[PDB]
Design a protein around this ligand. Structure first.
Ligand SMILES: [Mg+2]
Ligand SMILES: [Mg+2]
Ligand SMILES: [Mg+2]
Ligand SMILES: [Mg+2]
Ligand SMILES: [Mg+2]
Ligand SMILES: [Mg+2]
Ligand SMILES: [Mg+2]
Ligand SMILES: [Mg+2]
Ligand SMILES: [Mg+2]
Ligand SMILES: [Mg+2]
Ligand SMILES: [Mg+2]
Ligand SMILES: [Mg+2]
Ligand SMILES: [Mg+2]
Ligand SMILES: [Mg+2]
Ligand SMILES: [Mg+2]
Ligand SMILES: [Mg+2]
Ligand SMILES: [Mg+2]
Ligand SMILES: [Mg+2]
Ligand SMILES: [Mg+2]
Ligand SMILES: [Zn+2]
Lengths: 93, 161, 193, 192, 126, 63
RNA sequence: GGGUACGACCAUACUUGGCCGGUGCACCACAUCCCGUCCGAUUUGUGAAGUUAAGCGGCCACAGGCCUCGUUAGUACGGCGAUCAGUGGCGCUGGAACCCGGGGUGCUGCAAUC
RNA sequence: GAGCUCAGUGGGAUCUCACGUAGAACACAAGCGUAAAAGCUUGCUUGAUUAACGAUUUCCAGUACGAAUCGAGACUGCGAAAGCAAGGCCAGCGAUCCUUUGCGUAUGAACAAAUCAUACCAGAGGUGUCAGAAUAAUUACCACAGGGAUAACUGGCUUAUCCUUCGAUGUCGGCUCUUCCUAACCUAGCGGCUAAGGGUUGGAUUGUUCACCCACUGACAGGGAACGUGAGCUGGGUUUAGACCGUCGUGAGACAG
RNA sequence: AGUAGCUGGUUCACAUCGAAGUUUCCCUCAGGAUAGCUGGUGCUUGAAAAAGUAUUGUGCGGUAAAGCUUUAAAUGUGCAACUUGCCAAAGCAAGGUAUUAAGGCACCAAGUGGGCCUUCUUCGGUAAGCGGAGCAGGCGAUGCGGAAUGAACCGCUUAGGGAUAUGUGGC
């Protein structure tokens, strides 16, 4: 699904309270960092002689996933972000 | 303007619609009897449960025998055998309804108090017709028993009272 | 044969007044529609029609019996006010609508009829918008934007009221043909009403 | 041989005797059972049935709530009409939130030591059902009252909490255990 | 095995034969004060605000008028109880009731057998 | 298995309870708001005149 | 009584083909400008020479359709009943449609108007 | 928003005119609906945003998820305007934990700032077994708790069901012995019909039944009796463990071979 | 004393009421949880918000029949008996000065969650004492009387007894 590379979506910022063209960037999930509260648990829990200690999800059924779109008005840094429908090939242009 | 409806089949295996109409007729047992006046709305209730009832148009004599012999007032929820006219004036606080003759006129002439009267009577508990029925399964004109049998109910209902 | 007996069976006659061709109903059903929350308080409609000889402006509100025509201002009555000629031109529509707007206030936050173009195309400067601009200028709070006034440039989003004023005053027909003063005189003579 | 359909469902469950082991309730039921039967008064019929209730269903009343309900009753009384006795079939409890109360004449099964002293500090009598019967054998200007029971913490638990309309209180030793994010919660309100 | 919101509405939301088309002005000019009785007869030509299906033909009182919609309280028998439903509805789907028109006529107005001398009389035999 | 047998029987045991009376849970709430808000302004004024009315009746009753 | 505008119901007002004919309606003239098309055909603006041919409206169809009532028909089907018969009658009851035929072939509202 | 009318038919030359109730189109199955349109072109557009935790419908337990409806606030979009629009009606999707991203302060509790982490809050990553463990075979060497809720088997019904039986009703066959039936093979009487009386062989192959053969015979009929008959037998068939072969299997092992 | 959603057992009487084999959910299908059914406890007051029923009025419907995928039953089904927005504005809006029958509400809790048959209607299956549903009634849980016999047919449903008279069925 082709998506515009820019959109005048509405802006919650006080500086705005208005429609503004938003620089669209696709949301790609950030790196899974080591010292996340719950990675430290999983690591502590994987220390020792129980093998795997938590389930590892294996069987995906979804082929697609929701395409979060981070946005940001020219005016300021704040990144409004909004979901779309599932697509096998999001690609803004 | 008045039918003496009589439940004629027993209380087993009866459907929810017939089963309600019989309760509203106060025909909860077998040979119970009530006088119900023949409104269209009643004629459509009676038409709904005719296999469960025999009925017709009571003679003044049929009315006397039921009210005098089988007549029972509801009193404080008690089923009270009629025995005094004192008993009747107390039940019916009604300058119109004092005699047991007041009652027989109401449940025969069709009354302005036909409900005020017949409701204060416990539904009649008749004995099974002496000499038997014919077939509680067929309609009267089929050579059976149930359903409207016009003025003939007086005979049938006479053997019972 | 397309129109056999089976055709007239399954055929559903459209509404008489659409079948007659005299009314748009997607518009009639929106022009007439108002919030139900409004228990049914009046919603007047400035229906305006250009019968080929003469203009018709008609303040109106819908009713189930058939809509009431509260007030009307036919161009026929212009000559009663000194406009003896051009009784269907843009210069006249302004005074027709300004007339109904002024004959309607004569009974009576501003009164707010909304324009009912009917089927007329809303090209810029169409005579129908002259009835509005006349009536709107005459008192009624007809909602509108200058986009279809004559003298309103598409490119450059702004009206040329020095031009819009001209066609209102009948200068419009001057170049295709002293009248300009008989309309200003025409207008005082309809406020004299 | 009778339709009985819907007859049993109409049977009512009522107490006909007190479960109270207390001797005095039984002398007190002995009175108002009598007095309720031998008088035409509807007051004796209420004091007699309430007297048969559970201590659950005989909720205590605040002396605060008598002083309120009483003056609110008595303020309208035409001059020269002394105020009604404030009978309750239950305990009467002192209220710290109302330091000064009117010379009430309350009549109840039981009084807190605090209620009884505040009641007499105002000069009001703190009489029992014994002399209630001896002064108002009939409920003559008695003002029969009940203590509250909706604010009772047992009923805060009624229903489910998880069911959307509900504001039932979940059962929990741990207040923080079933605490929940605003997102995940049942809808608070819901039309019946 | 497949009960979506409009299961089995092939006939229910059909327009009557030669009576197709969006609701007219008589519809649009009907107005609903709260507590008015109404009939939730869904009209297919209007799709926004259409009543579920159970609510088709049900009567109920308006409890609510929004600008294009009429809130209606409609009893539903769920089991041993009639739950009292609150369908939201576009006003096209609400036909105002005459369910009380007789009774309103009443408080408007609140404000045997004999000889039959007939002579024609054919025999009834076969 | 999905038979619905004995269900309307089992349902009419305690009757079909009839629906709540209109005078009870007559909450607005999700009512079209602008009307709902003006209703508060009136109801609040009914309260000030209800209380103001009772204050009148007492002062009147001191006579 | 009719004409116009805006209508409500939306065929009894629809389709066809006839004939019939004061306000207006229309067609009609030109397009300079507002405005729009391959084309002023449509649309738009400006008119008032022409005509009612059409549109329009009204009257006619052994017209079709639609509406209406009857016939169909107490038929079909149906609810209840029977220690009914061997699908059907029956008893108590509710009761059509297609069809064919008689009739019918719009009606009402506001506004200014002959 | 505006303009427009379509599928198809027919008259002429992609076009043109006529008729043209939707017979087309409307992503996607189907229904629904739809004609100056909801279809088609066209223009401008981002209402497919935000949406104070508004209420509701569907599922329903009147829980959720999803989906949808009526709303309000914002800011818009289109439109002369009323109005219409918070996606493309309706299927298209998902908890807790965790990760992650955003957003506007809060916590890291002796104190303080920075870092880090956490929290609130709003999305996202997914559980398709879709109210959501993270999961390969085999067992004839097998085992236990049960089940006639459930096969084979056993009678019944029918022409497969799952009614009885799984704290067990001994399988095919034969042999042995009796018995009953007849849509009668022989015999008997008739002229195909009656006729159940008595009889209906011995062998080769194969467990067989069955079939086919050889011979006899007046003939070598068909069946029932829990597919008569295992506390009567026999144990050839079926036949557990042993083993061999073929095929299958990576293998253990499977095969009604 | 492993565990057992499985099997088996679980000891006085009487009285009062008395089911369910269905809903949603569950690695759930021999089990739970959930709701319904049931009991107990009340509470609340007494034609309150009564009704497996009609009548009347007003909606809804598209099955049988009809018809050649369209008109249209019957049985059904719903329902009824001064202050502060809008309007141009003070007027509109909103809140305020037949039969029968005890109604509603709460709490706690069990069993149940294999059903079966039949009536009528069907669906699947060549058919079945067959699988599946709808309706209602039954058996389950219930005798008694009757059909010679029969879980569910017929009649009737039931405290301990007597008279009377019947029901289905007979003589
Ligand atoms: Mg007999
Ligand atoms: Mg029977
Ligand atoms: Mg338009
Ligand atoms: Mg409290
Ligand atoms: Mg329909
Ligand atoms: Mg089950
Ligand atoms: Mg359009
Ligand atoms: Mg909320
Ligand atoms: Mg949701
Ligand atoms: Mg969707
Ligand atoms: Mg699941
Ligand atoms: Mg079995
Ligand atoms: Mg054998
Ligand atoms: Mg043996
Ligand atoms: Mg009992
Ligand atoms: Mg078991
Ligand atoms: Mg059909
Ligand atoms: Mg058929
Ligand atoms: Mg017997
Ligand atoms: Zn911004």
């Amino acid at each position: 699904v082709n998506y515009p590379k820019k959109k005048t979506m509405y802006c919650p910022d006080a500086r705005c309270k208005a429609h503004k063209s938003f620089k669209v960037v696709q949301y790609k999930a950030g790196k899974a960092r080591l010292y996340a509260r719950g990675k430290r648990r999983y690591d502590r829990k994987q220390s020792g002689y129980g093998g795997q200690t938590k389930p590892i999800f294996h069987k995906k059924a979804k082929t697609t996933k929701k395409i979060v779109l981070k946005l940001q008005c020219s005016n300021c840094k704040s990144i409004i972000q909004n979901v779309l429908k599932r697509t096998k090939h999001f690609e803004l242009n | 303007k008045v039918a003496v409806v009589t439940r004629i089949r027993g209380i087993a295996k009866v459907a929810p619609k017939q089963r309600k109409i019989l309760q509203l007729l106060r025909l909860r047992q077998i040979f119970n009897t009530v006088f119900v006046r023949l409104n269209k709305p009643m004629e459509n209730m009676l038409r709904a449960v005719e296999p469960y009832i025999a009925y017709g148009y009571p003679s003044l004599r049929t009315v006397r025998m039921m009210v005098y012999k089988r007549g029972h007032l509801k009193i404080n929820g008690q089923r009270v055998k009629i025995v005094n006219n004192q008993m009747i004036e107390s039940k019916y606080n009604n300058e119109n309804i004092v005699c047991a003759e007041d009652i027989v006129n109401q449940i025969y002439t069709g009354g302005k108090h036909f409900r005020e009267v017949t409701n204060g009577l416990w539904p009649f508990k008749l004995s099974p017709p002496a000499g038997g029925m014919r077939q509680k399964r067929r309609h009267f004109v089929e050579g059976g028993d149930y359903g409207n049998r016009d003025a003939l109910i007086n005979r049938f209902l006479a053997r019972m009272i | 044969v397309v129109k056999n007996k089976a055709y007239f069976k399954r055929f559903q006659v459209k509404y008489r007044r659409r079948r007659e061709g005299k009314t748009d109903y997607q518009a009639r059903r929106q022009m007439v529609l108002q919030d139900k929350t409004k228990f049914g308080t009046p919603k007047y409609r400035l229906v305006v029609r250009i019968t080929n000889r003469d203009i018709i402006a008609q303040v109106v509100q819908a009713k189930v019996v058939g809509d009431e025509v509260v007030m009307a201002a036919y161009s026929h009555e212009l000559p009663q006010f000194g406009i003896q000629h051009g009784l269907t031109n843009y210069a006249a529509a302004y005074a027709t609508g300004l007339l109904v707007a002024r004959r309607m206030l004569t009974k009576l936050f501003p009164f707010k009829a909304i324009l009912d173009v009917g089927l007329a195309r809303t090209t810029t400067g169409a005579r129908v918008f002259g009835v509005m601009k006349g009536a709107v200028d005459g008192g009624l709070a007809v909602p509108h934007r200058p986009n279809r006034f004559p003298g309103y440039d598409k490119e450059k989003d702004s009206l040329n009221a020095k031009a819009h004023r001209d066609r209102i005053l009948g200068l419009h027909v001057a170049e295709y043909l002293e009248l300009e003063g008989m309309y200003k005189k025409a207008h005082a003579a309809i406020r004299a009403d | 041989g009778v339709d009985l359909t819907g007859v049993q469902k109409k049977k009512r469950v009522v107490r006909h005797h007190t479960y109270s082991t207390n001797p005095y309730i039984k002398l007190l039921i002995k009175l108002y059972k009598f007095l309720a039967q031998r008088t035409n008064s509807a007051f004796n019929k209420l004091v007699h049935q309430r007297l048969l209730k559970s201590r659950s269903n005989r909720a205590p009343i605040s002396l605060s709530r008598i002083a309120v309900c009483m003056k609110r009753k008595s303020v309208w009384l035409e001059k020269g009409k002394k105020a009604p006795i404030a009978v309750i079939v239950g305990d009467v409890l002192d209220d710290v939130r109302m330091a000064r109360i009117p010379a009430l004449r309350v009549c109840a099964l039981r009084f807190s030591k605090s209620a009884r002293e505040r009641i007499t500090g105002a000069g009001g009598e703190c009489l029992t059902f014994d002399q209630l019967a001896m002064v108002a054998p009939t409920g003559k200007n008695t003002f029969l009252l009940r203590g509250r029971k909706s604010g009772r913490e047992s009923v805060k638990h009624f229903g489910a909490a998880g069911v959307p309309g509900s504001h039932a209180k979940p059962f929990t030793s741990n207040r923080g255990k079933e605490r929940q994010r605003s997102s995940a919660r049942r809808r608070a309100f819901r039309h019946k | 095995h497949s009960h979506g919101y409009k299961c089995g509405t092939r006939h229910l939301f059909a327009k009557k034969f030669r009576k197709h088309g969006v609701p007219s002005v008589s519809t649009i000019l009907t107005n609903f004060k709260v507590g008015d009785y109404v009939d939730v007869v869904a009209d297919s030509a209007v799709r926004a605000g259409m009543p579920h299906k159970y609510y088709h033909g049900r009567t109920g009182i308006v409890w609510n008028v929004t600008p294009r919609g009429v809130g209606v309280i409609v009893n539903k028998p769920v089991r041993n109880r009639t739950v009292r439903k609150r369908i939201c509805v576009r006003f096209e789907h609400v036909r105002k009731s005459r369910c009380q028109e007789a009774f309103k006529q009443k408080q408007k107005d609140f404000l045997n057998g004999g000889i039959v001398r007939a002579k024609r009389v054919e025999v009834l035999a076969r | 298995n999905h038979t619905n047998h004995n269900q309307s029987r089992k349902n009419h045991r305690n009757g079909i309870k009839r629906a709540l009376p209109m005078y009870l849970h007559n909450s607005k709430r999700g009512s079209w708001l602008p009307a709902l808000i003006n209703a508060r302004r009136v109801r609040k004024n009914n309260q000030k005149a209800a209380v103001k009315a009772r204050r009148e009746r007492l002062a009147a009753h001191k006579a």
